[PDB]
Amino acid sequence: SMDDDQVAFSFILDNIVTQKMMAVPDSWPFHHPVNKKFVPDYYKVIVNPMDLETIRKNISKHKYQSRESFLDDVNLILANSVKYNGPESQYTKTAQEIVNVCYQTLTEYDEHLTQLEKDICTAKEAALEEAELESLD
Ligand SMILES: C[C@@H]1COCCN1c1cc(C2([S@](C)(=N)=O)CC2)nc(-c2cccc3[nH]ncc23)n1
Q1: What is the total count of domains within the chain?
Q2: Candidate from 28, 30, 39, 51 with most ligand 1 atoms within 8 A of CB, to mutate
């Protein structure tokens, strides 16, 4: 089923987030959105904020249909640390470790993830095609 494949894909991504990325030592700065009351200028500097909680929310909404779209937001966490904290900040070194363990685990699950990504794409194109043939009935 398309629902089954979306569920499996999202569960794999979520397990990467909770079991690997959130387990990086000292990764607390990236676990939740920055609180504007604690860091008032953060959102003056960071136009496209991202964090691991928001990624999990997106996973739960089946936002990610590909490894690439997932990694777009994962890399946003690192890029926002580079911008706000600097490329040599310990915050950025931590974000880099989060990104690297993400890559390592996606590599581990690449065969299954690639198959799910293709089958989701195929099913989606078929459902789109069928919806359109039906609309003209
Ligand atoms: C801005 C820094 C560096 O970039 C990554 C983000 N990071 C953060 C992130 C967070 C959050 S929170 C608690 N939900 O706002 C998400 C955990 N809090 C802080 C913070 C809060 C209050 C006083 C502070 N002094 N120093 C840092 C700090 N900093």
Answers
A1: 1
A2: 39
Resolved by: X-ray
Report how far residue 101's alpha carbon sits from residue 24's, in angstroms, rounded to the nearest whole number: 8
Question: Which residue matches tokens 């909680």?
Answer: 53
- 27, 34, 41, 44: residue to mutate for ligand 1 pocket, most atoms within 8 A of CB: 34
9 Cβ closer than 6 Å to some ligand 1 atom: no
Question: Tokens 């070194």 sit at which residue?
Answer: 93
Question: Looking at ligand 1, which residue's alpha carbon is closest to its atom 7?
Answer: 29
Q: What is the resolution of this structure in A?
A: 1.9
Domain encompassing residue 121? 1-137
Q: How far apart are CA 34 and CA 102, in angstroms?
A: 21
Exposure on the CB side of residue 44, measured as CA atoms within 13 A: 4
Chain-centre distance of CA 124, in angstroms?
20
| DSSP H helical ranges for the chain | 2-15, 42-45, 52-60, 67-85, 90-108, 110-135
